[PDB]
Design a protein around this ligand. Structure first.
Ligand SMILES: N[C@@H](Cc1c[nH]c2ccccc12)C(=O)N1C[C@H]2CN(Cc3c[nH]c4ccc(Cl)cc34)C[C@H]2C1
Ligand SMILES: Nc1nc2c(ncn2[C@@H]2O[C@H](COP(=O)(O)OP(=O)(O)NP(=O)(O)O)[C@@H](O)[C@H]2O)c(=O)[nH]1
Ligand SMILES: [Mg+2]
Ligand code: NA
Lengths: 469, 167, 166
């Protein structure tokens, strides 16, 4: 038979499952909704582990339970009463013999020890992967240290001593590869001559590599705390989502830099060379699976100032027209081909973050926080699972590092790019559009001629890499 | 067979804009949503007795990707310009959204509707007369919607389709 | 994209977590933080086919030895890990092999025998002894180092191939 449980009067987590406290989806069960007590019971269940559920819960619980209250509840979960001696144990003791204590031993082995270990695993994941709760609330950290540091008894001792050390390391807080990274490539600008760095003087292969390293680092720095609760859209977004915003602002700045490079090149032949060079950078982005970079270029080519430059795109080689068209088609039909391509490539990659943001926001906005059943309000956990499925996908692509060498000067050049200068957004984008009208006027106005601005060769070195001994 | 209309929702972030398309597309009578589902943004409808397909682009949450707005907007034949009736700044943003749409579509007469969205019980700060005056100055319809009761939602989208049909 | 459920098992301290984190993050963990249960995901192209690996990293400490049936039920293939400088961990392999067979009620479960820490000179389990055991199980034997990455992709991706052909 099943093990008997403590009385639900002394231990709240022994209440029977009912539709008034837990609802399952239609081989471990999947929870649709439940009270917080039932969610924590199943988070730390004696019959099975659920590591996905631990991640989902720790990522999303603050929408229904405060951090201080979560810690109180898992401490209450940990403190399980042992059963009293049975009739057979009583009779042995009355005869001066040692009792078998068979039911007590089974309850320790099959209920207390698994539940207590799974509570500690929640604590371990909480400290390792969601430490911001403790960075933001020093008293919460004190309570966790005290709880862990006072767990007695030898069955948990190895993990208690380990978790204590992990906490202490987190308070005061290296990559190996299957091969060497390729050699850094140089074109007109030579190493150390940062004053000459520009779109056409750096090597287009190395532009794409260094932007990919930068954009990969920005992608990898975004934590789920910047996403849950849609906080990057709210009034405190600069406080709560700084890494996400830095990543988006880099993408926006690079797109605007591409547009500015194009429309400030007034000579037609020179502007064709500029657009052709940006499409070559896009080709290397594709080869590197840097989809953020691909769409940075596509967004620039479809911007109002650039899209209308029919005389420029007329002279682009047909093969490059095809490269740009197939990159543009990634975004068509609500990113259908992009989503399929992302799920087929071999990482490392840099995803486009915008689709994740829209899906998190709409999941949050389109589902209720609670479900009402039999007069009770149950936490709608299915909604939280959907959000954590998205943050889990994000995290999966954050693991794999690029095998490319940083070039500190090129990296600094792109970190310091500031095409808008001190101008506000509207005056700058109006400036770009007015430049477009200047260099290719609306029909029937005639096309003017403009002098060249570049004194160095415009011929591209191409995007196939070189390899000296 | 049937006509497909490509509609684009534009407007300030952080003030409940996404509720408009969610409430339209939703199982009207079950408050549930999975936006990752293929064609959670397509809906076959009957407007003035003529069946058509709406394809709705709502990039809510991507407002900080400001250099992508041109590309997103160019996909659309008609536009819902949305502000929140308790956020004056989102109302003041409407002029620049409309100017950007006109530039992207290269037309001074693009089908569009002005939508005032009630996203919570916070105090209204844009009166309906202010928004009606703005819509009239642009020559476009004005519809108010509730983010919670679905009131006005069908009217906003159907009015836009009528603007496209009568363009 | 096909999904594969891999489980890493073996005695405490043999390097199950270090192997997994090296595969996932290309990083070697120097600390010895005993695992309770961790899970990782990895999209990777293997033999031209994209798949999604779910990797369960399990507890080797004996105090957790009564909690294994639940993860053995879900797993589709098992990396059975010992350390080549730890003869007791090699002697523990057959207990994991037998429990997996009992739980899954099968003589034909995808498995790979892994001898980890092969970067260390002071070996106490000879390759021949481990290879003999692997042949008796009908499975391959791969020596690995989570520190240097030697053999790590080979071990995990060989297990994927055995699930795919199962
Ligand atoms: N004649 C064919 C093929 C073609 C010619 N030029 C091209 C350049 C790239 C890809 C295809 C072509 C056509 O579809 N057009 C001619 C015009 C020129 N204009 C190019 C453009 C500017 N910005 C863009 C961003 C993305 C994409 Cl895909 C294209 C562009 C857009 C109009 C469409
Ligand atoms: N030299 C060397 N040390 C290794 C290697 N793999 C793991 N170690 C070291 O061995 C120790 C234990 O590693 P760990 O991955 O935690 O082992 P585990 O098998 O996961 N232990 P547990 O079962 O308790 O979770 C750590 O100090 C780790 O750095 C290896 O290939 N070479
Ligand atoms: Mg471990
Ligand atoms: Na206001």
């Amino acid at each position: 038979g099943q093990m008997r449980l403590p009385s639900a009067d002394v231990y709240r987590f022994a209440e029977p499952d009912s539709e008034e406290n837990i609802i399952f989806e239609e081989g471990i069960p999947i929870i649709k909704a439940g009270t917080v007590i039932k969610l924590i019971e199943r988070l730390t269940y004696h019959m099975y582990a659920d590591p996905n559920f631990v991640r989902t819960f720790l990522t999303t619980y603050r929408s229904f339970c405060k951090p201080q209250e979560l810690l109180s509840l898992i401490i209450e979960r940990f403190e399980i009463p042992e059963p009293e001696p049975t009739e057979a144990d009583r009779i042995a003791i009355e005869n001066g013999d040692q009792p078998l204590s068979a039911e007590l031993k089974r309850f320790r082995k099959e209920y207390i020890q698994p539940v207590q270990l799974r509570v500690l695993n929640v604590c371990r994941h909480w400290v390792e992967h969601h430490f911001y709760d403790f960075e933001r609330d020093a008293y919460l950290l004190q309570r966790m240290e005290e709880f862990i540091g006072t767990v007695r008894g030898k069955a948990m001792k190895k993990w208690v001593e380990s978790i204590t050390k992990i906490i202490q390391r987190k308070k005061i807080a290296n990559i190996t590869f299957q091969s060497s990274p390729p050699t850094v490539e140089w074109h007109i600008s030579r190493p150390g001559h940062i004053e000459t760095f520009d779109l056409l003087t750096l090597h287009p292969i190395e532009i794409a590599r260094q932007l990919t390293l930068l954009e990969s680092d920005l992608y990898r720095a975004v934590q789920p705390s910047e996403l849950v609760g849609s906080v990057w859209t709210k009034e405190d977004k600069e406080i709560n989502s700084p890494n996400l915003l830095k990543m988006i602002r880099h993408t926006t700045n690079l797109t605007l830099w591409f547009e500015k490079c194009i429309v400030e090149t007034e000579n037609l032949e020179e502007r064709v060379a500029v657009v052709s060079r940006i499409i070559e950078i896009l080709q290397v982005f594709q080869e590197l699976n840097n989809f953020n970079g691909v769409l940075e270029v596509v967004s620039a080519m479809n911007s109002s100032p650039v899209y209308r430059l029919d005389h420029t795109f007329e002279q682009i080689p047909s093969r490059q027209k095809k490269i740009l068209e197939e990159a543009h088609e990634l975004s068509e039909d609500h990113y259908k081909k992009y989503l399929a391509k992302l799920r087929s490539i071999n990482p490392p990659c840099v995803p486009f973050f915008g689709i994740y943001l829209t899906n998190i926001l709409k999941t949050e906005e389109g589902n209720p926080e609670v479900l009402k059943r039999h007069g009770k309000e149950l936490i709608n956990f299915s909604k939280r699972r959907k959000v954590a499925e998205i943050t889990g996908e994000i995290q999966q692509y954050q693991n794999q590092p690029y095998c490319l060498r940083v070039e500190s000067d090129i990296k600094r050049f792109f970190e310091n790019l500031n095409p808008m200068g001190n101008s506000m957004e509207k005056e700058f984008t109006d400036y770009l559009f007015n430049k477009s009208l200047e260099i290719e006027p609306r029909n029937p106005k005639p096309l003017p001629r403009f002098p060249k601005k570049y004194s160095y060769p415009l011929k591209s070195p191409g995007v196939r890499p070189s390899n000296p001994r | 067979g049937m006509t497909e209309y490509k509609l684009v929702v534009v407007g300030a972030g952080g003030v409940g804009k996404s509720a408009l398309t969610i409430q339209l597309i939703q199982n009207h009578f079950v408050d549930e949503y999975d936006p990752t589902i293929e064609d959670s943004y397509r809906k076959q409808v009957v407007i003035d007795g003529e069946t058509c397909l709406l394809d709705i682009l709502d990039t809510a949450g991507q407002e900080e990707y400001s250099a992508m707005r041109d590309q997103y907007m160019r996909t659309g034949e008609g536009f819902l310009c949305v502000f929140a009736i308790n956020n004056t700044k989102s109302f003041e943003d409407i002029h620049q959204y409309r100017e950007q749409i006109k530039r992207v579509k290269d037309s001074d007469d693009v089908p569009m509707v002005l939508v005032g969205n009630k996203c919570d019980l916070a105090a209204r700060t844009v009166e309906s007369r202010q928004a009606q005056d703005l819509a009239r100055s642009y020559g476009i319809p004005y519809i108010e919607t509730s983010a919670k009761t679905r009131q006005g939602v069908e009217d906003a989208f159907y009015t836009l389709v009528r603007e496209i049909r009568q363009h």
